[PDB]
Each structure stands twice: as C-alpha cells, then as structure tokens.
CHARMM-style PDB file with segment names, atoms N, HN, CA, C and O in Angstrom:
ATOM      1  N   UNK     1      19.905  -4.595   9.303  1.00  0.00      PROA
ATOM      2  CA  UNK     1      19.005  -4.242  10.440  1.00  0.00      PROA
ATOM      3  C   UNK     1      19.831  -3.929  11.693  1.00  0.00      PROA
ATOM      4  O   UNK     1      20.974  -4.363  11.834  1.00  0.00      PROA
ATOM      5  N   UNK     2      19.254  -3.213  12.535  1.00  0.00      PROA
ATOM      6  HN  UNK     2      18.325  -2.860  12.420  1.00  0.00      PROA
ATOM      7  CA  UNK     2      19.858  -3.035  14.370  1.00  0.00      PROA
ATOM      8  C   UNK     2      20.045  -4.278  14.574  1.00  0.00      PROA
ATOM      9  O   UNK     2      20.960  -5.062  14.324  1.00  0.00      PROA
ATOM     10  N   UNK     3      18.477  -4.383  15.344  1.00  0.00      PROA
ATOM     11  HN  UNK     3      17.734  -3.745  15.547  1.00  0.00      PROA
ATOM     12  CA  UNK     3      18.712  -5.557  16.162  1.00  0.00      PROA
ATOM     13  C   UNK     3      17.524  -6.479  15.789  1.00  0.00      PROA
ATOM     14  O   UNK     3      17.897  -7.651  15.814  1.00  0.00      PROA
ATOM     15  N   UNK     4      16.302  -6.355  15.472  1.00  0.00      PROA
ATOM     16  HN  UNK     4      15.999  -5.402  15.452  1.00  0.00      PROA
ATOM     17  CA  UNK     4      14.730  -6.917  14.506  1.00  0.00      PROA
ATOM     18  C   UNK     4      14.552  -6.322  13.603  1.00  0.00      PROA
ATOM     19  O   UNK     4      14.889  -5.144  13.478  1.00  0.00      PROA
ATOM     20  N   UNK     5      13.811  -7.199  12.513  1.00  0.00      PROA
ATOM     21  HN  UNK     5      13.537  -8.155  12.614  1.00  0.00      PROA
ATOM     22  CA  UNK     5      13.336  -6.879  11.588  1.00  0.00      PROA
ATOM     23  C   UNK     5      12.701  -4.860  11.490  1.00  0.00      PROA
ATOM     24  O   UNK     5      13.305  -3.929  10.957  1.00  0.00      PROA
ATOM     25  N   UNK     6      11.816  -4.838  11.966  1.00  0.00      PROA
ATOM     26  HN  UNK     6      11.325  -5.595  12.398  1.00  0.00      PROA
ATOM     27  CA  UNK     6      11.155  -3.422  12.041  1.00  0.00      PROA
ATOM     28  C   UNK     6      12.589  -2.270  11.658  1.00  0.00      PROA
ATOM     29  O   UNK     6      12.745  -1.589  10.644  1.00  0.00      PROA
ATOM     30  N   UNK     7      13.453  -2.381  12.832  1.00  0.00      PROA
ATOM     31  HN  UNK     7      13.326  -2.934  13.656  1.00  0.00      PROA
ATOM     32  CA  UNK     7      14.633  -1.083  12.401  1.00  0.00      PROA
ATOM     33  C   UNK     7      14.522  -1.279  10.902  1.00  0.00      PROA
ATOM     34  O   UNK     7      13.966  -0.450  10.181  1.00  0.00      PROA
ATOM     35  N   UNK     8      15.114  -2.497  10.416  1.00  0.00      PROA
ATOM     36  HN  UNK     8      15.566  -3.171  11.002  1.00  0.00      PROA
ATOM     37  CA  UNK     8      15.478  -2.722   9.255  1.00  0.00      PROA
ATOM     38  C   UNK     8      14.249  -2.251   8.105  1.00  0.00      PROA
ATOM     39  O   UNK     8      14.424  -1.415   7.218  1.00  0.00      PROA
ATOM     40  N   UNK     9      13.202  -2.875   8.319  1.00  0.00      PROA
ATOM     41  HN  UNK     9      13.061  -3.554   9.040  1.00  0.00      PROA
ATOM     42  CA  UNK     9      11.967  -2.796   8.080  1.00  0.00      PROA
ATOM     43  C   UNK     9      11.171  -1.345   7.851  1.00  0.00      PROA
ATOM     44  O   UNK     9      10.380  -0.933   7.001  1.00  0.00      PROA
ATOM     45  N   UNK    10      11.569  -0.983   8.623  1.00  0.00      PROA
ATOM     46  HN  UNK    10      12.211  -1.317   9.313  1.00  0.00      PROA
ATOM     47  CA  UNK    10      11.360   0.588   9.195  1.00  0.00      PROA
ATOM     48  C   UNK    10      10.920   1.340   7.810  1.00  0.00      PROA
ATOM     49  O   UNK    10       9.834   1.914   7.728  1.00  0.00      PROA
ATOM     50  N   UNK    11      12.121   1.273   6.423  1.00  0.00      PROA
ATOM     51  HN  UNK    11      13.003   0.807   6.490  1.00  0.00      PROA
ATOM     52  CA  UNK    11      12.169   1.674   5.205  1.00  0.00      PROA
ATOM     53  C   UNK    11      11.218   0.761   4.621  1.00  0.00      PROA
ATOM     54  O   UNK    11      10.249   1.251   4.041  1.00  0.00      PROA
ATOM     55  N   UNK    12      11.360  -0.638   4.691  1.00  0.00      PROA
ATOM     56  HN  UNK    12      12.147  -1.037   5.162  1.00  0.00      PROA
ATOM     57  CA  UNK    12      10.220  -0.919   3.630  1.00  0.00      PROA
ATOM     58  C   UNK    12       9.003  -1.507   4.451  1.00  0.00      PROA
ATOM     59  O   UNK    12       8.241  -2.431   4.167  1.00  0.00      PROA
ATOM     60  N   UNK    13       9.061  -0.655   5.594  1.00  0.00      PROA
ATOM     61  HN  UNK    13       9.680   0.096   5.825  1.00  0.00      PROA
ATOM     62  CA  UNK    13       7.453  -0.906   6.112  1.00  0.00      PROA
ATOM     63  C   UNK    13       7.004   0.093   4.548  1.00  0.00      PROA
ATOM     64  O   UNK    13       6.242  -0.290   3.660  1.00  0.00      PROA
ATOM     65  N   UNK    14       7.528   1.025   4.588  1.00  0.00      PROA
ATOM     66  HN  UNK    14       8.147   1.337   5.309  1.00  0.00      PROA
ATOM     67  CA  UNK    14       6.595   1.571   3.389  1.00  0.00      PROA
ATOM     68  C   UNK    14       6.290   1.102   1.704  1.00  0.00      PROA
ATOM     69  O   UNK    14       5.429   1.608   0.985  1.00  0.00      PROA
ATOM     70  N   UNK    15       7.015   0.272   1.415  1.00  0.00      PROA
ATOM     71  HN  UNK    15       7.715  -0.138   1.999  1.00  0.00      PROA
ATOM     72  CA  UNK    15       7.028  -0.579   0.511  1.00  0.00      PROA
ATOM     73  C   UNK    15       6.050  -1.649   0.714  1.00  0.00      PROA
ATOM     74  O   UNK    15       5.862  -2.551  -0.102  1.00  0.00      PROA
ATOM     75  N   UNK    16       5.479  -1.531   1.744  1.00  0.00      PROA
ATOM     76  HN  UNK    16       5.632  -0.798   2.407  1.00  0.00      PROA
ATOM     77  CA  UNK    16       4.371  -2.548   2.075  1.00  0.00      PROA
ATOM     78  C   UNK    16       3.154  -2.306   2.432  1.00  0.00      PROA
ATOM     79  O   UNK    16       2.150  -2.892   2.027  1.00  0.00      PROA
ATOM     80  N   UNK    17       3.247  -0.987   3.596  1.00  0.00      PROA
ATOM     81  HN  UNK    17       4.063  -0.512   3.924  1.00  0.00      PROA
ATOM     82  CA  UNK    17       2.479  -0.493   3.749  1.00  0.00      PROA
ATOM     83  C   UNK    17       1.619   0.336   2.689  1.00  0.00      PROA
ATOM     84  O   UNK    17       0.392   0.442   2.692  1.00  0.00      PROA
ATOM     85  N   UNK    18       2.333   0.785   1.967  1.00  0.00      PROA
ATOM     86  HN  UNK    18       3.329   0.698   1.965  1.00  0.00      PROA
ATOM     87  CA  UNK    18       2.410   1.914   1.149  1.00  0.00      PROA
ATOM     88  C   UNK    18       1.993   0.891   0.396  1.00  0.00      PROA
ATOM     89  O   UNK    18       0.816   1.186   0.192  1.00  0.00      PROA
ATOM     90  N   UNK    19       2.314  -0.670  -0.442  1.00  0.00      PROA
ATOM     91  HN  UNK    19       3.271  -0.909  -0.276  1.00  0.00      PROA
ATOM     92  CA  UNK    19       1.928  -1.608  -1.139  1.00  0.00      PROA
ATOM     93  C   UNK    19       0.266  -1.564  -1.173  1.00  0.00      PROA
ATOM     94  O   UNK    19      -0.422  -1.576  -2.194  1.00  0.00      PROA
ATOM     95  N   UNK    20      -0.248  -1.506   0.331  1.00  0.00      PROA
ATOM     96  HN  UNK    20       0.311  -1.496   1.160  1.00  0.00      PROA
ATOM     97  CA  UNK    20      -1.848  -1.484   0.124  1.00  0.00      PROA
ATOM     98  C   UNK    20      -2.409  -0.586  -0.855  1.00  0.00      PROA
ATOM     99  O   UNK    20      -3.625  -0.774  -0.814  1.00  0.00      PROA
ATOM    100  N   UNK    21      -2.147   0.269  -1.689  1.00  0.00      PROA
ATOM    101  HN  UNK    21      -1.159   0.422  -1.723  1.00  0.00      PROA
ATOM    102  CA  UNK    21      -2.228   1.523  -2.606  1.00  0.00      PROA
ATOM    103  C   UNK    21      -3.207   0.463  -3.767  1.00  0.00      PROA
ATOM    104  O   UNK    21      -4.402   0.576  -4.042  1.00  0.00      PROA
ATOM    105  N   UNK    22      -2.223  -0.537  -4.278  1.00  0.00      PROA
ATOM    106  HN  UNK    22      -1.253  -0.629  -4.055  1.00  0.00      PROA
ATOM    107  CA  UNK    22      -3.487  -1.277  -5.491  1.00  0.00      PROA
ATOM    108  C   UNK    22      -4.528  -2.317  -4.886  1.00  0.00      PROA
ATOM    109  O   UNK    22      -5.693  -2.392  -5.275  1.00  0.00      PROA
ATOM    110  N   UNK    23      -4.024  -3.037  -3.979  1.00  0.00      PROA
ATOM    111  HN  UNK    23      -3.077  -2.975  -3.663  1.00  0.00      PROA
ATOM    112  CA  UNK    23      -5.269  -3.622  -3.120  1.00  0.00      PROA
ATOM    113  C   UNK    23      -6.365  -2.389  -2.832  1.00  0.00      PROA
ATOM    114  O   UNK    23      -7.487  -2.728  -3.208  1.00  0.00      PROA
ATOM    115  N   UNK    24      -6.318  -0.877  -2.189  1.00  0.00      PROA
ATOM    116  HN  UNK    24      -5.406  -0.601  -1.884  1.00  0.00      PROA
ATOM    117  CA  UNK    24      -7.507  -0.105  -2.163  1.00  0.00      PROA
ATOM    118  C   UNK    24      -8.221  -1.312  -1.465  1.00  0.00      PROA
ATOM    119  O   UNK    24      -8.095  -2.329  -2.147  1.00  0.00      PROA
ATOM    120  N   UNK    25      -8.773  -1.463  -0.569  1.00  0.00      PROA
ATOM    121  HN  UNK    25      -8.875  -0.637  -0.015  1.00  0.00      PROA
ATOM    122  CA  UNK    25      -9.894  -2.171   0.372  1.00  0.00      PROA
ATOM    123  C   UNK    25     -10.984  -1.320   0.063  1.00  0.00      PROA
ATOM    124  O   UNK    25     -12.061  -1.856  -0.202  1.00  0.00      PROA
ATOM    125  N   UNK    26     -10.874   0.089   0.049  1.00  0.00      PROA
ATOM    126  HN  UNK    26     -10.000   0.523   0.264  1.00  0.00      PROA
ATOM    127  CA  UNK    26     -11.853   1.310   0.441  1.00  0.00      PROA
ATOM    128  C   UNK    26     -12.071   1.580  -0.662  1.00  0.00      PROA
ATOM    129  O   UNK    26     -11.550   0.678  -1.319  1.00  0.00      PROA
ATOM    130  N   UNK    27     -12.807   2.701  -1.712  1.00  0.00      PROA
ATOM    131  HN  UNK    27     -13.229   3.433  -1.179  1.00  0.00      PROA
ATOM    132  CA  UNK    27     -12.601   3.820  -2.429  1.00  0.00      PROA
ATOM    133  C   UNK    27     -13.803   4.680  -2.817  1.00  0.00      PROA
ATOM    134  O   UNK    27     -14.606   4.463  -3.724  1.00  0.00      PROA
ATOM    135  N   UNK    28     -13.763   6.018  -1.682  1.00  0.00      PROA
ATOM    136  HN  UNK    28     -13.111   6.195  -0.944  1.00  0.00      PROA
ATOM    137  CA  UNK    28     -14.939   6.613  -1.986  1.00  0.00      PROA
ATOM    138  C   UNK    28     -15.302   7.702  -3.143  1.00  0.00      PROA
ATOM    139  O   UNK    28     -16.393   8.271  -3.126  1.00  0.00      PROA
ATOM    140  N   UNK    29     -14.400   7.943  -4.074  1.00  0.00      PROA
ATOM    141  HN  UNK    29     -13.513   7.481  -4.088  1.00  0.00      PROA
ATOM    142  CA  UNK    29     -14.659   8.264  -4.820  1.00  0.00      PROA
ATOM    143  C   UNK    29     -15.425   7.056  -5.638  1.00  0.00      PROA
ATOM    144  O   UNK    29     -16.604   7.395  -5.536  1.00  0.00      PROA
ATOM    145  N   UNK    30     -15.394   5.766  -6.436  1.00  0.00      PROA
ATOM    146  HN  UNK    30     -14.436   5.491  -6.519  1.00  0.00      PROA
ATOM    147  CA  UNK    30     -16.551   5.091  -6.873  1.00  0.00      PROA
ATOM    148  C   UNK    30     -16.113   3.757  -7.206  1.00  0.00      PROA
ATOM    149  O   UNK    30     -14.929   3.557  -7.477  1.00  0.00      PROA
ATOM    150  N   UNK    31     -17.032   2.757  -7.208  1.00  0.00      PROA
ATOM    151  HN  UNK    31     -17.994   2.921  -6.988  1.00  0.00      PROA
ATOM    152  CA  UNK    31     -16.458   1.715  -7.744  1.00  0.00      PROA
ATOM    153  C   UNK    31     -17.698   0.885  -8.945  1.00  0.00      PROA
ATOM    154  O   UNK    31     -18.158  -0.248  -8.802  1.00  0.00      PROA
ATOM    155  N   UNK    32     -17.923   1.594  -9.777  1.00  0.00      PROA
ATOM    156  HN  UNK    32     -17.549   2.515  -9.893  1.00  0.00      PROA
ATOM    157  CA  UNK    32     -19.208   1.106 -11.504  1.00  0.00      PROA
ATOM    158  C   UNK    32     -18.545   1.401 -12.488  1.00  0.00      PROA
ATOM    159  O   UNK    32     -18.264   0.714 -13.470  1.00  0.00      PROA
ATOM    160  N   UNK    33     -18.212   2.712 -12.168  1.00  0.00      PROA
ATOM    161  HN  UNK    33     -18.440   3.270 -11.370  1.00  0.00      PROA
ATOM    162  CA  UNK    33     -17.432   3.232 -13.315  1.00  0.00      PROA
ATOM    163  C   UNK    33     -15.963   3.033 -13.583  1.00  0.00      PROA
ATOM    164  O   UNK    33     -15.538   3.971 -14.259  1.00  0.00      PROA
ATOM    165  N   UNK    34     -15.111   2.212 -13.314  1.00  0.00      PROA
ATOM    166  HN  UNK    34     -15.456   1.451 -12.765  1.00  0.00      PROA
ATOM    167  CA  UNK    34     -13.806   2.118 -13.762  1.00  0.00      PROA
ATOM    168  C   UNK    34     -13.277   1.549 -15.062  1.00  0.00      PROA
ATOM    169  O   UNK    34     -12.075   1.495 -15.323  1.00  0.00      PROA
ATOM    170  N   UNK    35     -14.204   1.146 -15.831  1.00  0.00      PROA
ATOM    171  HN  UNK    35     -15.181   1.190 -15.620  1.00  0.00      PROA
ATOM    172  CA  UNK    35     -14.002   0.811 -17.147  1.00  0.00      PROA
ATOM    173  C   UNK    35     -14.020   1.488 -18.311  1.00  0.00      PROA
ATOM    174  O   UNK    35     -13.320   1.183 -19.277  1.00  0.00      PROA
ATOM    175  N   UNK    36     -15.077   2.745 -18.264  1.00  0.00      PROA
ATOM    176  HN  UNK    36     -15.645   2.993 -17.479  1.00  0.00      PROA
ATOM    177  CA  UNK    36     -15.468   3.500 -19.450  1.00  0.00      PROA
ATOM    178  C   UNK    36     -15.211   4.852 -18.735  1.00  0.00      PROA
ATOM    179  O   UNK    36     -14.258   5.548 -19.087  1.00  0.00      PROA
ATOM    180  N   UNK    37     -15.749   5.100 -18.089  1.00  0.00      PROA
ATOM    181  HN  UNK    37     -16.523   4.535 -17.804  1.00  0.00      PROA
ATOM    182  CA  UNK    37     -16.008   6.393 -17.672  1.00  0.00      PROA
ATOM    183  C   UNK    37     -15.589   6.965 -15.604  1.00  0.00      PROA
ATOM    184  OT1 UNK    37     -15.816   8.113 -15.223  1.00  0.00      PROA
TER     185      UNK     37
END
C-alpha cells in the first residue's frame, strides 16, 4: 500500500466490490424461475 488501506485496496476494492456479483441483492430479470426454467 502508499500510505492506507484504499491505495492498496484500490485493486481489490474490486474483488469485493465486484464480490457483490453472487450476493445480487437486486435482480430484475426474475427470481421463481431459477431452478427449471
């Protein structure tokens, strides 16, 4: 890192941020159908 976490961080803010991807909070395409169809 520079000088805090974040510089350092900076790269895997997206490894984290980017982590929210399987959590999905949202998804408007659908959420009944993810098993079959």
């Amino acid at each position: 890192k520079c000088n805090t976490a974040t510089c350092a961080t900076q790269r895997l803010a997206n490894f984290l941020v980017r982590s929210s991807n399987n959590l999905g909070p949202v998804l408007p395409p659908t959420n009944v159908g993810s098993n079959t169809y």
